[PDB]
Amino acid sequence: LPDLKIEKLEEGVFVHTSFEEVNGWGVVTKHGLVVLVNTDAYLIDTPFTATDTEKLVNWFVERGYEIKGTISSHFHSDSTGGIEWLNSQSIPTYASELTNELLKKSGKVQAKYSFSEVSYWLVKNKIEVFYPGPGHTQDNLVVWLPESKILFGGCFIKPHGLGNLGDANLEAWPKSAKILMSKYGKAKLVVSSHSEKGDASLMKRTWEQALKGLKESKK
Ligand SMILES: C[C@@H](O)[C@@H](C(=O)O)[C@H]1CC(SCCNC=N)=C(C(=O)O)N1
Ligand SMILES: [Zn+2]
Ligand SMILES: [Zn+2]
């Protein structure tokens, strides 16, 4: 499978794309972000593997950046697979307390730092972490970049098919989608884990898909 790809979105915002075969889903394409604050870099989700996480870190280190911190949007491996490697390099990893306990219960390595707040400033006025409510998972988070007006929706944004429902809360997802739409209507760009980037309407598409999946789940 190809190496991690890095693509600039605009000044200070990069998309990282990694590929992994996962048991019954075939090769998964996963998008995360790298956000620059001056000469500091922040990883928004880890790629699937230690190897891709190392390639990503080394790419920004070679371009003169310090990796100040990572945030995992939820406990699944497409958001957290790099945490063990980052910890071994003493790069600060962050997850919600709920995410870290879901990781523990799954026998996975935890982020070194956790937080319980619904709205958490990873970097004050630069990187906000928000819990809209359950959807894709009980713990899923989004990341908001107030300066660029970019929203990273992770595996919660699902405009054309909900994907893995194993850990999903179909009852809550529509309500959580409305909360997200209410908070981030002013997003100029929505980046998701597995879909094409788009405008704020991807939040409304997610609301519609969640309702459609909830109606389906009731034979
Ligand atoms: C591999 C694991 O992280 C998994 C998950 O988080 O549930 C991946 C694989 C999947 S299915 C791949 C994409 N299919 C439809 N969007 C999803 C997802 O549904 O968000 N994420
Ligand atoms: Zn997931
Ligand atoms: Zn996913």
Task: Delineate the domains of the chain, giving CATH numbers in brackets.
Answer: 1-219 (3.60.15.10)
Please, which residues bridge with residue 93 across strands? Answer: 70
Please list, in sequence order, all residues whose beta carbon lies within 8 angstroms of the beta carbon of residue 176, skipping any fewer than 6 positions away. Answer: 132, 133, 134, 135, 156, 169, 210
Contact by Cβ (8 Å): 165, 158: no
Amino acid, res. 71: I
The preferred substitution site among 17, 194, 206 for testing ligand 1, maximizing ligand atoms within 8 Å of CB, is 194
Distance from C-alpha of 154 to C-alpha of 172, rounded to nearest angstrom: 17
Burial class (CB in 10 A: 0-12, 13-18, 19+), 97: middle
Residue 175 CA, ligand 3 centroid: distance in Å? 20
Q: What is the structure's resolution, reported in angstroms to one decimal?
A: 1.9
160 annotated ligand-binding residue: no
Closest C-alpha residue for ligand 1 atom 6: 76
| CB of 12 shorter than 6 A to ligand 1 | no
Q: In Å, how far are 115, 124, 130, 180 from 119, measured between CA atoms?
A: 10, 11, 5, 12
